[PDB]
Amino acid sequence: AENLWVTVYYGVPVWKDAETTLFCASDAKAYETEKHNVWATHACVPTDPNPQE
Amino acid sequence: QVQLVQSGAVIKTPGSSVKISCRASGYNFRDYSIHWVRLIPDKGFEWIGWIKPLWGAVSYARQLQGRVSMTRQLSQDPDDPDWGVAYMEFSGLTPADTAEYFCVRRGSCDYCGDFPWQYWCQGTVVVV
* Rounded distance between C-alpha atoms, residue B65 and residue B19, angstroms: 16
Resolution of this model in Å is 8.8
Q: Find the closest chain B residue to A34 by CA distance.
A: B27
The C-alpha atoms of residue B38 and residue B47 are separated, in whole angstroms, by: 6
**Separation CA B128–CA B13 (nearest Å):** 5
Q: Do A36 and B27 touch (CB under 8 A)?
A: no
Work out whether the CA dihedral B20, B24, B30, B31 comes out positive or negative.
negative
A34 touches chain B (CB under 8 A): yes
CA distance B36 to A26: 38
- Breaks in chain A (C to N over 2.5 Å), named by the residue before each, are none
Distance CA(B43)–CA(B46), nearest Å, equals 8
CB-CB neighbors (< 8 A) of A34 in chain B: 27
Whole-number Å distance between alpha carbons of B90 and A29: 41
Are B27 and A34 a contacting pair at CB < 8 A?
A: yes
Query: How many degrees, rounded to 5, is the angle at CA B120 between CA B116 and CA B121?
Result: 155
- For residue B74, CA distances in Å to B29, B37, B56, B92 come to 8, 21, 10, 28
Task: State whether residue A36 sits within 8 Å of chain B by CB.
Answer: yes
Q: Between chains, do B82 and A36 touch, taking CB under 8 Å as contact? A: yes
**Beta-bridge partner residues of B59:** B50
Categorise residue B52: left if φ over 0, alpha if ψ from -120 to 50, beta otherwise. beta
Q: Which chain A positions have a beta carbon within 8 Å of B27's beta carbon?
A: 34
Which experimental method was this entry solved with? Answer: cryo-EM
